[model samples]
Target: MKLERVTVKNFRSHSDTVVEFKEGINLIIGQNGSGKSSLLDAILVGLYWPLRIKDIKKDEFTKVGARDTYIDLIFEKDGTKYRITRRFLKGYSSGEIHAMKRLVGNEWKHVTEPSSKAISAFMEKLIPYNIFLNAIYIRQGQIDAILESDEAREKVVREVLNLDKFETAYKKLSELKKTINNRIKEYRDILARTE
Candidate 1:
């Protein structure tokens, strides 16, 4: 998947902000403190935040005087364009809201309701979260992050990335392999005598 554009209202003037992305160098940068990272962070809010759906705060991402914040992420995969939107309006639940849509002949069609499960199910269908993290989404100063992580940085893997699924597979395989272990040993003795 390639990011085509991102629009962010956080840490910005009280106006709608739209960004046009250029290929090969869609840079995310600004002053040393604050601004821009929250713009790019929208992608996570759009696609990944729903999985855990916690700990997001306006104080962390938006201007203190912000009345609302919205992150619009647009990307294309396999020639089809899609949009994911994360919206937050003060006095509206104080939580993140997300939606997914596909561009059809210049018309945007809703792919999933505001339901997180539907969004996550389709997400795994097209893009894995780690693929974007490892293969793409490189921050400038962190370009050597690939080489920087030795045995030390893998805490992210065992900590969050696919840990739930790993646990589920471990639970399933133990019981199934337990049964197979008995059968294969029995078959081995019979085959030894037959030979």
Candidate 2:
């Protein structure tokens, strides 16, 4: 899916912002504290679930006493268009997805429920990030944690090498070996002739 645009409100420091991204190679450029990183975080949050506690210090994030945060994303994929909007309020958050269409040239309408799982499944199939990145938001402090954890490192190796299939093959081979050995001992003389 291609991200056509994003609209964010009350997320981090930005009160209201609308970003129109190009179809390809969109670059967000700004100085430090200019909300560039926050913009990325907003996009990540829109596509995935809320940030974990480890993502940011409680005092540093969630905005001081802010009741809610919201993000909206518009994009198209495979001849179909989709609009996703998410809101977090009072420790509760909800999102909705809309299927865009024009009937003989008309405005778009909401045709489907907001589906976090559907969005995730579609994006995961398209990009397959699950095998590589555990978190959609990549904070610098957690990069070392990922490298240090063997389980986290295995996530990448398993995906890149497709180790699960190989492991299954090995298990099947071992079972077959045991079965073959058990039968061969029963007919040792016949087995030699058969071989």
Candidate 3:
């Protein structure tokens, strides 16, 4: 999956901004406080709003005195385009969010159903936020940490390769097995008592 564009409105230092990204490495360079980091924050906010990023608060996302804020993000996966829009109301207490997947051969038409949960779940399936953060989204000092330990390096490699899915599936299967064994024991006890 790759981000194609992002639009942010009244979020942090960015009042209204639109950024487009191309294929391959894209660098964000600017002086301090030039809204470079703000752009990245906007992407995260647009993609994963209502979910705080570390120490940043949801209310702190909006510009000062701004009643509300909104972000729109467009991405592509498997040759299909998808968009996510997140909004925050006054005091950043409440807002609306939606997602739309572009129809094939019809870029203008988007099939959307309003549900944050559904949108989040869909996005999670495409790219879980944790995996994104750990793999492609590297913060300052994180690279050193990843290189310092072999385990961490291997973990990061696995995340980038999407190998975590196997681990997740294994965990789920183990839980299911345990639950079935417990149920079988319960059935055996019931049969003994009845007999």
Candidate 4:
């Protein structure tokens, strides 16, 4: 999928901004404390809403004086376009999604917010493999860690990016191992044949 654009409002250091993404690499170069990381953080939050930011301290994300936070994403994939927006209040959060055909005559229509189960199912279909080296987002100090150790480079693939596949494989293996152990213990004739 390609993220065509992003709109961020009252999030981190961004107070109402819209960014248009290009097909290739889009770099944000700035000096320290210049909200470079904040921009990236907004995208990550938008991508994985409902997931808390890693190690965010109390009120760490509150924009100077804003009472709420929000991020929006517009993208296209597989001949269909999508727009997703997420909002966060001091005590609550919510999101919505819109989908439409990739044609001029088409009109964007809102889609039901998938339940957690449905969202998991949809995510599994979209991301197929682990791409830790460069296919994922790394925020703040993570970039330094990623640059520091080759071993840590693959951490994203193993831990964060391929969550769906890892969960599925782990569950399947757990079940299979249990079944095999039970069969081995119960089927004395089968065990004897093996022996």
**CA lDDT, every prediction?**
0.65, 0.60, 0.75, 0.59
Candidate 1, residue 53: how far the Cα is off, in Å:
10
Candidate 1 RMSD computed on C-alpha atoms after optimal superposition onto the true structure: 8.8
Per-residue lDDT of candidate 4, residues 1-195 (tens digit): 677878888766788877899888888688988777777767655655434555454344433343666667777768667666665555443323322223334665544344433443344455432331126545446666577777675764455554557678889999999999888787977778898
Q: Which candidate is the best by lDDT?
A: 3
Of the candidates numbered 1 and 2, which has the greater lDDT value?
1
Q: Comparing candidate 2 with candidate 3, which one achieves the higher TM-score?
A: 3
How far residue 126's Cα lies from its native spot in candidate 3, in Å, is 1.5
Candidate 4 Cα outliers beyond 4 Å, as residue runs = 52-54, 57-66, 90-105, 114-124, 128-134, 138-195
Predicted structure 2, TM vs. truth: 0.51
Clashes counted in candidate 2 amount to 2
**Candidate 1, residues 1-195: lDDT per residue as tens digits?**
677777777534424667787778555567864545555555565666554323455354433444667778888999989888877666544655667899998788978776657777778777876666544654344434435766433544443343556777888999899899999999999999998
TM-score, one value per model:
0.61, 0.51, 0.66, 0.56
Comparing candidate 1 with candidate 4, which one achieves the higher TM-score? Answer: 1
Ranking by lDDT: 3, 1, 2, 4
Q: In candidate 2, where is summed lDDT lowest over 10 consecutive residues?
A: 95-104
What is residue 176's positional error in candidate 3, in angstroms? 24
Error of 2 at 139 (Å): 8.8
Q: Specify the highest-TM-score model's number.
A: 3
